[PDB]
Structure 1
Amino acid sequence: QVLLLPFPAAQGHTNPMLQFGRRLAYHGLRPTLVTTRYVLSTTPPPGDPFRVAAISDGFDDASGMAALPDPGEYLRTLEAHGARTLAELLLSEARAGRPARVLVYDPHLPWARRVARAAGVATAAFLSQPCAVDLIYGEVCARRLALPVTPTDARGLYARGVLGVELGPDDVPPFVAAPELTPAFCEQSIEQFAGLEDDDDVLVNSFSDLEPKEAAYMESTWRAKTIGPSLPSFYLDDGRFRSTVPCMEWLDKQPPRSVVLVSYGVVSTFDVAKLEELGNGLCNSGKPFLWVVRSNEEHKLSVQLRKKCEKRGLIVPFCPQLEVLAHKATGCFLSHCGWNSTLEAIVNGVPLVAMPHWADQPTISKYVESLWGMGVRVQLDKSGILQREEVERCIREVMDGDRKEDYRRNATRLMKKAKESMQEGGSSDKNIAEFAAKYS
């Protein structure tokens, strides 16, 4: 009866929506995770308190994304099959005596809203990106900013007290500042907001103290309510643990605050040359490091670079990232600065080396370095290349610089406020409780 519909196969949208769903189950609601038939056949289910249900994206037996690597093509296929099968699911669930009370959906599936509203099901948008990025996309949707969005447009928003930092060219969201590079992602980013005013509720995985001006503006403009960081309650010190993963055993043997965790997420791909610069930078830093290089990227790693990494590092295809970040051995996180990774670092008080690619990452990386003060951003050379020397410099700058304590201080400060927000009486907890009562 509360249906949860993340963008399919995006763990960064899945995890936080499941964590919201767990808190709703605490309040006595009944959550169901809605995923594709493919993901359902090929992934273990979430377990209690969740039911699971399926829709189709056109590809029930193979990965549709794999088959349809042009983003606009995959997204029109998902819309056509998904909208049909979501409507069928709303009816089958009602016929099975489990009518949906509300659909909480990722607005990167904007067809979900129309499908649900036409079945008479309430709708709640769930934004898994930061308010600062979200509100820029909403301004374009509302026809208050043209494309492309410029630094001058961002400076206006700063001047008006809506953004808390002045975004330059390398900081504005590329999907709207350089829309020709990613047409389908531009349109998807802006369409999140088309019809959002028709929703019963709008939720965002952030907390007001982290993004005060932006959260306030999202609330006044879009009715968006902060409900994050939407993470396991253990990490938030909310009293209302420890795996057997082999990389964790490695981490246990390293000294306190010694290790660099390295990940560029599950989406972006790095060519052989970029992997070479990244891995050599890690080895040249002299620090112990845990390098996540996905199974689907690891063919790009040479024998000699892997051997070089054996001295002080460990390369894995996946790690339990929250458990790593919480570990006493972890000193910093060299991250692409996707929002889930950034929130996970904040909740654990871990300083950041930001290596953004696209989406929300450039904007987050500017916040990290220039407002929040919790790390540094790598500087690309004149031709856009990340050099091993710069990877190394940034690692050493956060772990050893004159400013080491500045990044730590800010990470810790933010950590405390993130926990406050989710604990009883906190700004995000209040919004969760409001929602749970509404739908009880």
Structure 2
Amino acid sequence: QVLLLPFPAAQGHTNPMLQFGRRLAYHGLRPTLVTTRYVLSTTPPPGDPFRVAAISDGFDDASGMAALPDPGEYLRTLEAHGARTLAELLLSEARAGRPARVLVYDPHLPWARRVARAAGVATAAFLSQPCAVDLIYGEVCARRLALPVTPTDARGLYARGVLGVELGPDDVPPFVAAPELTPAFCEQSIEQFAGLEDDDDVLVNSFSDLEPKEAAYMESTWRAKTIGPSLPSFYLDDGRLRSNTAYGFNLFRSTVPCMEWLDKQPPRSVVLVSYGTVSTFDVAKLEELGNGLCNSGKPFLWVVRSNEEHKLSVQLRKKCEKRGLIVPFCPQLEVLAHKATGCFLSHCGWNSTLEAIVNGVPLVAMPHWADQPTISKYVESLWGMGVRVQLDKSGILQREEVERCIREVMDGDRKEDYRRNATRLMKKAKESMQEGGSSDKNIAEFAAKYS
């Protein structure tokens, strides 16, 4: 009855959409996760309260995206077989007494919108990036803003009280500030907003107290309602869903344990390190990162993915045994909530950021692309909960800067500010998702409307 369509295999898009579905279920709606037959065949299903329903990207027996390395050429294949299979599913379900009351869809998949509207199924866009990045892409689609987006473009927005911070050249979203480096990602980011005004609902995974100017603008401009942070209820100290304590659809397996190692560590001492589930680091970059961690002297929990750890030398991996632990995946929210954890050296993907916020953990920001540079700027200025690594003239992260930023957040004069500010945002985040808060209300309205 409620269909959920995250960009398949995108952990950063699947996690919040599923958490949003859990809230819907709490309000009596029945959610269904819609993903590829491949992903469904390699990942155990979320479980109650979710049904599962499979579409196809063409490659039902093999990771479509390793087989089809070019970004542009994956999307076309997904769009082709997806749109076909999606429309099949709608009719099947309707002709089974289970029509779709609404399709909640990742707007990185604009063809979902088309297939649905053709069946007269209501649509709700699910934006899983911060308002501040969303509205910038938005202003480009609306041709209110001209490619390339510049710090001056951004300063106008700030002057008009739409952006709460002034974006510099390294803070504007790369995908539209330098579209040349990533032409496919550029149009995908802008396409999101084409046909959005024609959606029954627009939903953004954020909360208003976090981005008050940007969320005000997104609501008035695109009808976007904040429904986040869309994380398990437990971490929001929300007891309505007692058993909602972990994301239920991990696309990566946790081989090596870390929780018992974390127990042994002293309070507020561990650096969590992760650049997420999408980005890749080359050999030299892993070396600077790892040595920066060792030189910092702090204990650290370093997430180096299975499909990355081959780029990790034996020599460096042994050097990290003294004070660190290296794992392919960790229960990141559980880690962030742990007493031992002192800060989070993170690429600042939006879920990682919201997960740090909801646990009051200060950040060392090492962004690469997409929304991460903008998020990093917010972490550093307006939110004041951490610092961003400075890259040198060649764009290289050096081990000295890694150690410097860690010591700065953990031991510097401002260490209590970063913590205070993080705790400050933590309380507003929890408030917005608890019964009666601003995101909680938006979620209840949405559910009321389709029940």
State yes or no: 1:185 paired with 2:168: no
State yes or no: 1:367 paired with 2:346: no
How does the TM-score come out when normalised to structure 1? 0.99
Q: Is the 8 A contact 2:204 2:224 kept in 1?
A: yes
- 1:55-80 residue CA offsets vs partner (Å, 9 max, x unmatched): 00010000111111100000011011
TM-superposed deviation, 1:316 = 0.3
- 1:304-332 residue CA offsets vs partner (Å, 9 max, x unmatched): 10010000000000000000000000000
How does the TM-score come out when normalised to structure 2? 0.96
TM-superposed deviation, 1:95 = 1.2
Q: Is the 8 A contact 2:344 2:363 kept in 1?
A: yes
Q: Secondary structure at the match of 1:78?
A: helix
TM-superposed deviation, 1:96 = 1.6
Q: Is the 8 A contact 1:262 1:290 kept in 2?
A: yes
Per the alignment, do residues 138 and 19 of structure 1 end up closer, same or farther by CA in structure 2, a change over 3 Å counting?
Answer: same
Q: Is the 8 A contact 1:333 1:350 kept in 2?
A: yes
Q: Is the 8 A contact 2:108 2:189 kept in 1?
A: yes
TM-superposed deviation, 1:242 = 17
Aligned ranges 1:338-417 → 2 under 5 Å:
338-417=349-428
Q: Is the 8 A contact 2:255 2:329 kept in 1?
A: no
Q: Secondary structure at the match of 2:197?
A: helix
Q: Is the 8 A contact 2:126 2:204 kept in 1?
A: yes
Q: Give me the whole-angstrom Cα distance separating, in 2, the residues matched to 1:242 and 1:303.
A: 22
The CA RMSD over aligned residues, in Å, is 1.5
State yes or no: 1:289 paired with 2:322: no
Per the alignment, do residues 289 and 30 of structure 1 end up closer, same or farther by CA in structure 2, a change over 3 Å counting?
Answer: same
Q: Secondary structure at the match of 2:397?
A: coil
- 1:236-282 residue CA offsets vs partner (Å, 9 max, x unmatched): 0111x999972001000000000000000111110100000000000
TM-superposed deviation, 1:417 = 0.2
Q: Is the 8 A contact 1:242 1:323 kept in 2?
A: no
Q: Percent identity?
A: 100
Q: Give me the whole-angstrom Cα distance separating, in 1, the residues matched to 2:304 and 2:105.
A: 30
TM-superposed deviation, 1:146 = 1.0
Q: Is the 8 A contact 2:344 2:364 kept in 1?
A: yes
Q: Is the 8 A contact 2:34 2:55 kept in 1?
A: yes
Q: Is the 8 A contact 1:138 1:193 kept in 2?
A: yes
Q: Is the 8 A contact 2:256 2:328 kept in 1?
A: no
Q: Give me the whole-angstrom Cα distance separating, in 2, the residues matched to 1:55 and 1:35.
A: 6
TM-superposed deviation, 1:302 = 0.8
Per the alignment, do residues 243 and 315 of structure 1 end up closer, same or farther by CA in structure 2, a change over 3 Å counting?
Answer: closer
Runs of 5+ consecutive residues of structure 2 not aligned to the other structure: 240-251
In the other structure, the counterpart of 1:302 is 313
- 1:383-415 residue CA offsets vs partner (Å, 9 max, x unmatched): 111100000000000000011001000000000
Q: Is the 8 A contact 1:374 1:408 kept in 2?
A: yes
- 1:92-139 residue CA offsets vs partner (Å, 9 max, x unmatched): 111121110100000000110110010010000000000000000000
Runs of 4+ aligned residues of structure 1 deviating over 3 Å after TM superposition are 241-245
Q: Give me the whole-angstrom Cα distance separating, in 2, the residues matched to 1:126 and 1:342.
A: 18
- 1:125-179 residue CA offsets vs partner (Å, 9 max, x unmatched): 0000000000000000000111111110000000000000000000000000000
Q: Secondary structure at the match of 1:433?
A: helix
Q: Secondary structure at the match of 1:66?
A: coil
Q: Give me the whole-angstrom Cα distance separating, in 2, the residues matched to 1:207 and 1:95.
A: 38
Aligned ranges 1:195-206 → 2 under 5 Å:
195-206=195-206
Q: Give me the whole-angstrom Cα distance separating, in 1, the residues matched to 2:70 and 2:137.
A: 22
In the other structure, the counterpart of 1:33 is 33
Q: How many residues align?
A: 439
Q: Is the 8 A contact 2:254 2:328 kept in 1?
A: no
Q: Give me the whole-angstrom Cα distance separating, in 2, the residues matched to 1:284 and 1:108.
A: 40
In the other structure, the counterpart of 2:283 is 272
State yes or no: 1:439 paired with 2:450: yes
Per the alignment, do residues 276 and 206 of structure 1 end up closer, same or farther by CA in structure 2, a change over 3 Å counting?
Answer: same
Q: Give me the whole-angstrom Cα distance separating, in 1, the residues matched to 2:7 and 2:253.
A: 29
Q: Give me the whole-angstrom Cα distance separating, in 1, the residues matched to 2:95 and 2:445.
A: 29
Q: Is the 8 A contact 2:346 2:363 kept in 1?
A: yes
Q: Is the 8 A contact 1:5 1:103 kept in 2?
A: yes
Q: Give me the whole-angstrom Cα distance separating, in 2, the residues matched to 1:168 and 1:311.
A: 39
Q: Give me the whole-angstrom Cα distance separating, in 1, the residues matched to 2:266 and 2:17.
A: 35
Q: Give me the whole-angstrom Cα distance separating, in 2, the residues matched to 1:54 and 1:205.
A: 24
Q: Is the 8 A contact 2:302 2:325 kept in 1?
A: yes
Q: Give me the whole-angstrom Cα distance separating, in 1, the residues matched to 2:139 and 2:391.
A: 29
Q: Secondary structure at the match of 1:64?
A: coil
Q: Give me the whole-angstrom Cα distance separating, in 1, the residues matched to 2:389 and 2:369.
A: 14
TM-superposed deviation, 1:85 = 0.4
Q: Is the 8 A contact 2:257 2:327 kept in 1?
A: no
Q: Secondary structure at the match of 1:63?
A: coil
Q: Give me the whole-angstrom Cα distance separating, in 2, the residues matched to 1:422 and 1:265.
A: 24
Per the alignment, do residues 21 and 62 of structure 1 end up closer, same or farther by CA in structure 2, a change over 3 Å counting?
Answer: same
Q: Is the 8 A contact 2:350 2:371 kept in 1?
A: yes
In the other structure, the counterpart of 2:323 is 312
Q: Give me the whole-angstrom Cα distance separating, in 1, the residues matched to 2:97 and 2:39.
A: 25
Q: Give me the whole-angstrom Cα distance separating, in 2, the residues matched to 1:388 and 1:79.
A: 42
Q: Give me the whole-angstrom Cα distance separating, in 2, the residues matched to 1:327 and 1:35.
A: 32
